[PDB]
Amino acid sequence: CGAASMTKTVQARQKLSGIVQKQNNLLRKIEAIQHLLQRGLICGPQLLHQIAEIERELNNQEQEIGSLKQRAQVEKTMSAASGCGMGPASMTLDVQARQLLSGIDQQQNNLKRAIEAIKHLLQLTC
């Protein structure tokens, strides 16, 4: 029993940072589809395959993100069970890294709502 180390704290920060980056790339791919459909009619499997790959990566991110949240829950509970209490010493992610993760979680739902809206638009339009 003890507290998190610096090589783990940077691993996890860097993990959060990579998710932010993946979300931002997905957003740019969704914006590109949105702009395509503003440019005119593009019916067919071409854009459905890309929508499907985007949902794919979004669902992967849902897991990566739920894992981090639940891993924090494992650390908190194990620490209590070991006689070391809580605080952010027992936690690889501190109150600040946990706050980013709330915004990342929220952005994960925004992106899903958006790719669905886009899918349903193309579905109607076609």
From Swiss-Prot:
Q: What membrane topology does the annotation report for this chain?
A: Single-pass type I membrane protein
Compartments it resides in? Virion membrane; Host cell membrane; Host endosome membrane
So what does this one do?
A: Acts as a class I viral fusion protein. Under the current model, the protein has at least 3 conformational states: pre-fusion native state, pre-hairpin intermediate state, and post-fusion hairpin state. During fusion of viral and target intracellular membranes, the coiled coil regions (heptad repeats) assume a trimer-of-hairpins structure, positioning the fusion peptide in close proximity to the C-terminal region of the ectodomain. The formation of this structure appears to drive apposition and subsequent fusion of viral and target cell membranes.
Q: How does it assemble?
A: The mature envelope protein (Env) consists of a homotrimer of non-covalently associated gp120-gp41 heterodimers. The resulting complex protrudes from the virus surface as a spike. There seems to be as few as 10 spikes on the average virion.
Report what the protein is called: Transmembrane protein gp41
UniProt organism field: Human immunodeficiency virus type 1 group M subtype B (isolate MFA) (HIV-1)
Q: What is the lineage of its organism?
A: Viruses, Riboviria, Pararnavirae, Artverviricota, Revtraviricetes
